[PDB]
Amino acid sequence: PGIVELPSLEDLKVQEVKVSSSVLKAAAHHYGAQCDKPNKEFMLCRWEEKDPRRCLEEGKLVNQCALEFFRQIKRHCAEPFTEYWTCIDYSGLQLFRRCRKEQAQFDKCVLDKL
Amino acid sequence: PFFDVQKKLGVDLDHWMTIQSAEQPHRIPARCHAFEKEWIECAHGIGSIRAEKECKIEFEDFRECLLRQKTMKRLNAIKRQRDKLIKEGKYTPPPHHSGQEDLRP
Amino acid sequence: MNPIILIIILMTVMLGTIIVMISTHWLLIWIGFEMNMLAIIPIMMKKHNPRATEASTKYFLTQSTASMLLMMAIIINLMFSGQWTVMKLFNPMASMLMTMALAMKLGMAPFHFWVPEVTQGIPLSSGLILLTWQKLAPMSVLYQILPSINLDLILTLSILSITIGGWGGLNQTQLRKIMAYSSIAHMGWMTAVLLYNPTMTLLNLIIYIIMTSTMFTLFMANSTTTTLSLSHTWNKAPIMTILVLITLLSMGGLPPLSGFMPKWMIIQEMTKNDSIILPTLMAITALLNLYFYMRLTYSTALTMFPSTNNMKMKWQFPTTKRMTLLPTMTVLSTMLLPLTPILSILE
Amino acid sequence: MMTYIVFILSIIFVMGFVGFSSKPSPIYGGLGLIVSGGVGCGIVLNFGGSFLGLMVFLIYLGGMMVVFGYTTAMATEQYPEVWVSNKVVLGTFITGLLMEFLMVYYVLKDKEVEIVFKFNGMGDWVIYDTGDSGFFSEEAMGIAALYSYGTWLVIVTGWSLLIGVVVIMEITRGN
Amino acid sequence: MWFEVLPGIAVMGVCLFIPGMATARIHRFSNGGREKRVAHYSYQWYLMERDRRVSGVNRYYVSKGLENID
Amino acid sequence: MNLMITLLTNFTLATLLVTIAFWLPQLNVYSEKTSPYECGFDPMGSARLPFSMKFFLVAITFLLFDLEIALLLPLPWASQTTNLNTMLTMALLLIFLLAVSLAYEWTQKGLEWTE
Amino acid sequence: VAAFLKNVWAKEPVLVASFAIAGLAVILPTLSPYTKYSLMINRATPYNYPVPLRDDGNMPDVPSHPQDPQGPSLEWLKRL
Amino acid sequence: MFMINVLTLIIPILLAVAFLTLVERKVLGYMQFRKGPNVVGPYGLLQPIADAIKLFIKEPLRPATSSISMFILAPILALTLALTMWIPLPMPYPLINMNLGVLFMLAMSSLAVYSILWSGWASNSKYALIGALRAVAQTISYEVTLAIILLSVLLMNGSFTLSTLIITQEQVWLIFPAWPLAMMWFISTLAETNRAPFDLTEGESELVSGFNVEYAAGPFALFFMAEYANIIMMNIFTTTLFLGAFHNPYMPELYTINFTIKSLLLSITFLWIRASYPRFRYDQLMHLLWKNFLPLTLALCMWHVSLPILLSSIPPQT
Amino acid sequence: MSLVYMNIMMAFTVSLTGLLMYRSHLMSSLLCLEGMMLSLFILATLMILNSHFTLASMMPIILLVFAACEAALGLSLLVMVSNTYGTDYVQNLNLLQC
Ligand SMILES: CCCCCCCCCCCCCCCCCC(=O)OC[C@H](COP(=O)([O-])OCC[N+](C)(C)C)OC(=O)CCCCCCCCCCCCCCCCC
Structure with missing residues (x-):
């Protein structure tokens, strides 16, 4: 019957946030706080369009803003963040309870310097 | 004698489960939510005979969403062609399909 | 049987029938059918006799097979349709399996091999409850899915039911097997007209229920389960012979009695569809049913059989049994012809 | 022949069903159906139905432990047949296994059989989803909304089980 | 006297210590020094598959941090 | 997959012991040791x-x-539902139905023994 | 009613204890003060995604940032 | 490397079964004012080895009247079923992390009776039939109570996972809010494993040996090890359910030491219980569990249903 | 449709032919009936789990539940025969023919 109209592979070729699960979980609250606008724009247009072939620019902007946030994390508070995501990654269930000292140090550092 | 007392007393007994496109706990859609919505809203109140005679396309699309059998025939045809072309020997798989591909994230 | 437990059992079977009546879900339909099964089962075992156990085993096995066929039809309809609304079915094989399930539940031929033994092995009140209350829920289900019913299948089952019921009723001396084969014949007459006008099916079901309940009430009143005792009823009371004569004339199909009211109008809803030879064949088998009815009337009322000397004792005590609404149901079973258009209340 | 694990479990299901459908003796029929129910529960676990598979497992174990008690109580013959002590039991078992292998050979060859409906030869894993349901399982909220959404269903199920208790009490009274 | 059972039962203690401890030590080998990633729902499996797909060695336990991006 | 490996290993260890228990020692049977x-x-x-x-x-x-x-x-899992009142009322109702069945068994002489 | 209660407590204390626990479990949640706290605790668990809405310009309640004071807070469970 | 983990799970529990036989005979002698086995080895350390080799160099002695299929199938199935439910136990990290490990334990515990039924019916004797009937009655007694005990204890856990059961112990034991259910669970574990005073199958005074009275050596030892693995594992499960210890992710040695000591003490308590009381009749088994246990556990089940709603203490399912 | 659907429905009709052709024992037919219900349950659960219909997940187990609510009745319809006849052979169950 109908025909499908798929996007070209060049448009989908975009660099990625090549990190792990524990690194994403460690900076999850601050990423959700600072980067709310492009994420909410992407979520709204995906919910109201229901078509991933027309929902690429907002995903690109979400990815770019996430990588920018992680670059800003890398420039200022690298080593406390490394300690935080390391001790988060040691736990099997990725529990936020077993990382109170590292979380306190990380939030204090990122509040004092950013 | 279909005594529909569910509308006489206004009490909902089993209208919340009878249709795949109903209200679900924690708002989880099924695999054919949109097709169910189209098939209900196109064939509402006009009678079963007119619904079958006129709304056949969306019901066919819903049945294809559910059973997926035409996609099975498509996959069977391309896989038989692939097996044949490997068996005679004029086809080589790409490195992306073979496994060493380094996926997107 | 405990009266409170019996009342709970009766409320359970009526609740199951009501659940089948009012539900818009296939699972609730099957749940009501299972409740109907499980509540009618101890009704037959009120007397704790081996005949009752044999009848209960046969009934339970046949209705279990019907229930499993109904579940397979429901699952096929679900898989090809994705919902549960009680409406037209979306597969011919699901329609087949549900039609076989409902035919097994009703007792329609060639699945008639369980009704006469089940009726014979149980008392008269249990037979009344069976042959009246078990013919409401499957009729409602067939009323719901009549768009998807195959015409040839239901018509073949109907004509087989009427022919087999007449030929069975020609050669039975027991009253309950006569009732069972008459019920098969009425079932075929009632389900032959289902696809043309289901209001005719409902009207014939109502008239058949009224007449069968009237006859079972008269049998309970006379406490007779054999043809010879039914003949012996003439000495106990003449009025009982008058009512059995007029009622068994009514179920024969004679005017101006009420039993001519449904069947004739069945033809009135089958000549409009230009089906001519089928109502003629069903009228011929109705004449066969009238023949065994006429033999029974010759046995009971029109000829007074010799009696015994013990019945004089029975002349000194009036009938203290409770005849539940007997004159009203007899009048409705006899003289309902001049109120023929009242079937329009069933639309 | 690796990703046909659902196919292999279904074949063991049909094999056990043919095995206990010969009706040799209630204990051996229970054993055959229990093997069949084990591989059916394996099917349901392999499709993500942990709760439903374990529930059908536990229910069948209880029910035919009761069936074992009943056949060792009343319905016993002097010399029960295993599978080969009688002729028609072995005949229908071999017959059912032969038809089972018949459509096995029919479905592994042309990949499309036509028995009533049409049937394909690929595994069912192709229809399984590519999406993720988050921090939860959907069937768990099905059986959780059993109590909240399911009002009439739970009411009639409980009433039917109570009626089953009172009926089973009433039947085996004798007087 | 009574304390003479205290040798033999102690052996059973070792027989109740060797299995479970070994599992923990096995969990400190195949997972590269960390615990085994306990997957309970679809999102935990999706995150573990994300680590597997980003590590480039097809091992989920090789966790790469913020030094991976530039 | 690991459940299948554990099942196969357990069955292998189980069926290896009886084979060791059977085919290793010397058998000597007459028609009295096999008697019931x-x-x-x-x-x-x-x-x-x-x-x-x-x-x-x-x-x-x-x-x-x-x-x-x-x-x-x-x-x-119903403890995580929103409509808590219906949950509590009908869990209590089903437990009460269980207790009603047990009490009817108790009164009508069902928990005792025949003969 | 004291003599009957003493009689059943002397004959079978298990039935008396079971009926006391059943009556307590029936009548106490209807007198509980924390049931509505359980209601909002269950209702406040963020299972699915909180998708935003389109803007026509006229909404005083919903915020544009998660840290804005407008919108519902969760201070009652934090203190408790 | 799952094979090494499986082997290190399944072999030392068999060694634990053997040394459980050792300390069983020793302690059971010791409350009877006599010494235990101490002649064969130093303090009798070589008694289980002699017992194990002795049973495996005897004659299997298959009966003629016994149906050989279930006769050879019952003990292997018993040993496998006693072995196959050890996996969901957190020790502190379980072998297989199943979300519904409680249901797996319940279903494999329901399967464990089938070896007893098949061994009773396979051997053609009256004593085996009576033992099978008593085992059926024992299952009738214990299942309908044990399921409700486990559900009502588990209602504060929040989910069926045994891994999250170690999280709930971090503040207090669940034996403090569920001590009556702890008593019910201990009597149920007494009843399920077929240990005195709830043995009723391997009776010495009532029957000769009951379900395995026709079972000679070789096949007989499998039932012995299956029952002893069952009681050790059941006591470990009770320890995890009610007396869970302090878990530290950086040092599993603490939790292994603690639950090993607690389960060993509970098994010693089981040995203490099993030889101080007369054996119950099996007609009083369901004159107690269907009469006294069931209404009490129904009341406690509805109490534990209505309690987190009362105190606003609904546990998380994750 | 698929393959496992074919296997399950063929198991159902195999158990149906097992029930519909008796072999002189009632409880064996009861076992075949419970096998037909096993095929029904397996088919329904697989159909739901393929179609992601969460809210209908109550229907299989409840179906299963109701089957036991009749299956014990069949067992309750066995011993009564054993309370009249010595055995439970169906060829002895022919008293209802007159
Ligand atoms: C798991 C942790 C460790 C547990 C303890 C382990 C060590 C101790 C083991 C002791 C020996 C156990 C085995 C031998 C006994 C086996 C038989 C047996 O147990 O029979 C059960 C016995 C049988 O009783 P019986 O044998 O006396 O029966 C006689 C019955 N009448 C009187 C009718 C004739 O008891 C029960 O069935 C009762 C169940 C347990 C009761 C628990 C009550 C808890 C508190 C409830 C509330 C109380 C306050 C009042 C209400 C308040 C309301 C707000």
Whole structure:
């Protein structure tokens, strides 16, 4: 019957946030706080369009803003963040309870310097 | 004698489960939510005979969403062609399909 | 049987029938059918006799097979349709399996091999409850899915039911097997007209229920389960012979009695569809049913059989049994012809 | 022949069903159906139905432990047949296994059989989803909304089980 | 006297210590020094598959941090 | 997959012990060591006679109570539901139905034994 | 009613204890003060995604940032 | 490397079964004012080895009247079923992390009776038939109570996972809010494993040996090890359910030491219980569990249903 | 449709032919009936789990539940025969023919 109209592979070729699960979980609250606008724009247009072939620019902007946030994390508070995501990654269930000292140090550092 | 007392007393007994496109706990859609919505809203109140005679396309699309059998025939045809072309020997798989591909994230 | 437990059992079977009546879900339909099964089962075992156990085993096995066929039809309809609304079915094989399930539940031929033994092995009140209350829920289900019913299948089952019921009723001396084969014949007459006008099916079901309940009430009143005792009823009371004569004339199909009211109008809803030879064949088998009815009337009322000397004792005590609404149901079973258009209340 | 694990479990299901459908003796029929129910529960676990598979497992174990008690109580013959002590039991078992292998050979060859409906030869894993349901399982909220959404269903199920208790009490009274 | 059972039962203690401890030590080998990633729902499996797909060695336990991006 | 490996290893270890227990030692059988054990005398009939077992209703109602358990078992996840009042009312209702069945068994002389 | 209660406590204390626990479990949640706290605790668990809405310009309640004071807070469970 | 983990799970529990036989005979002698086995080895350390080799160099002695299929199938199935439910036990990290490990334990515990039934019916004798009937009655007694005990104890856990059961112990034991259910669970574990005073199958005074009275050496030892693995594992499960210890992710040695000591003490308590009381009749088994246990556990089940709603203490399912 | 659907429905009709052709024992037919219900349950659960219909997940187990609510009845319809006849052979069950 109908025909499908798929996007070209060049448009989908975009660099990625090549990190792990524990690194994403460690900076999850601050990423959700600072980067709310492009994420909410992407979520709204995906919910109201229901078509991933027309929902690429907002995903690109979400990815770019996430990588920018992680670059800003890398420039200022690298080593406390490394300690935080390391001790988060040691736990099997990725529990936020077993990382109170590292979380306190990380939030204090990122509040004092950013 | 279909005594529909569910509308006489206004009490909902089993209208919340009878249709795949109903209200679900924690708002989880099924695999054919949109097709169910189209098939209900196109064939509402006009009678079963007119619904079958006129709304056949969306019901066919819903049945294809559910059973997926035409996609099975498509996959069977391309896989038989692939097996044949490997068996005679004029086809080589790409490195992306073979496994060493380094996926997107 | 405990009266409170019996009342709970009766409320359970009526609740199951009501659940089948009012539900818009296939699972609730099957749940009501299972409740109907499980509540009618101890009704037959009120007397704790081996005949009752044999009848209960046969009934339970046949209705279990019907229930499993109904579940397979429901699952096929679900898989090809994705919902549960009680409406037209979306597969011919699901329609087949549900039609076989409902035919097994009703007792329609060639699945008639369980009704006469089940009726014979149980008392008269249990037979009344069976042959009246078990013919409401499957009729409602067939009323719901009549768009998807195959015409040839239901018509073949109907004509087989009427022919087999007449030929069975020609050669039975027991009253309950006569009732069972008459019920098969009425079932075929009632389900032959289902696809043309289901209001005719409902009207014939109502008239058949009224007449069968009237006859079972008269049998309970006379406490007779054999043809010879039914003949012996003439000495106990003449009025009982008058009512059995007029009622068994009514179920024969004679005017101006009420039993001519449904069947004739069945033809009135089958000549409009230009089906001519089928109502003629069903009228011929109705004449066969009238023949065994006429033999029974010759046995009971029109000829007074010799009696015994013990019945004089029975002349000194009036009938203290409770005849539940007997004159009203007899009048409705006899003289309902001049109120023929009242079937329009069933639309 | 690796990703046909659902196919292999279904074949063991049909094999056990043919095995206990010969009706040799209630204990051996229970054993055959229990093997069949084990591989059916394996099917349901392999499709993500942990709760439903374990529930059908536990229910069948209880029910035919009761069936074992009943056949060792009343319905016993002097010399029960295993599978080969009688002729028609072995005949229908071999017959059912032969038809089972018949459509096995029919479905592994042309990949499309036509028995009533049409049937394909690929595994069912192709229809399984590519999406993720988050921090939860959907069937768990099905059986959780059993109590909240399911009002009439739970009411009639409980009433039917109570009626089953009172009926089973009433039947085996004798007087 | 009574304390003479205290040798033999102690052996059973070792027989109740060797299995479970070994599992923990096995969990400190195949997972590269960390615990085994306990997957309970679809999102935990999706995150573990994300680590597997980003590590480039097809091992989920090789966790790469913020030094991976530039 | 790991469950299948554990099952196969357990079955392999189980069936290896009986094979070691059977085909390793020397067998020497006559027609008295294979005889059924009846405390040193011949058996009276066979053991395939129907037992006049007395707790048939207890086994059937064990089945029914296990199905009551099957209704009552998904209760913990229902603790996460929003409509808490209907949850609590109907969990109490189903437990009360179980208790009603048990009380009717108690009063109508069902928990005792026949003969 | 004291004599009957003493009689059943002397004959079978298990039935008396079971009926006391059943009556307590029936009548106490209807007198509980924390049931509505359980209601909002269950209702406040963020299972699915909180998708935003389109803007026509006229909404005083919903915020544009998660840290804005407008919108519902969760201070009652934090203190408790 | 799952094979090494499986082997190190399944072999030392068999060694634990053997040394459980050792300390069983020793302690059971010791409350009877006599010494235990101490002649064969130093303090009798070589008694289980002699017992194990002795049973495996005897004659299997298959009966003629016994149906050989279930006769050879019952003990292997018993040993496998006693072995196959050890996996969901957190020790502190379980072998297989199943979300519904409680249901797996319940279903494999329901399967464990089938070896007893098949061994009773396969051997053609009256004593085996009576033992099978008593085992059926024992299952009738214990299942409908044990399921409700486990559900009502588990209602504060929040989910069926045994891994999250170690999280709930971090503040207090669940034996403090569920001590009556702890008593019910201990009597149920007494009843299920077929240990005195709830043995009723391997009776010495009532029957000769019951379900395995026709079972000679070799096949007989499998039932012995299956029952002893069952009681050790059941006591470990009770320890995890009610007396869970302090878990530290950086040092599993603490939790292994603690639950090993607690389960060993509970098994010693089981040995203490099993030889101080007369054996119950099996007609009083369901004159107690169907009469006294069931209404009490129904009341406690509805109490534990209505309690987190009362105190606003709904546990998380994750 | 698929393959496992074919296997399950063929198991159902195999158990149906097992029930519909008796072999002189009632409880064996009861076992075949419970096998037909096993095929029904397996088919329904697989159909739901393929179609992601969460809210209908109550229907299989409840179906299962109701089957036991009749299956024990069949067992309750066995011993009564054993309370009249010595055995439970169906060829002895022919008293209802007159
Ligand atoms: C798991 C942790 C460790 C547990 C303890 C382990 C060590 C101790 C073991 C002791 C020996 C156990 C085995 C031998 C006994 C086996 C038989 C047996 O147990 O029979 C059960 C016995 C049998 O009783 P019986 O044998 O006396 O029966 C006689 C019955 N009448 C009187 C009718 C004739 O008891 C029960 O069935 C009762 C169940 C347990 C009761 C628990 C009550 C808890 C508190 C409830 C509330 C109380 C306050 C009042 C109400 C308040 C309301 C707000």
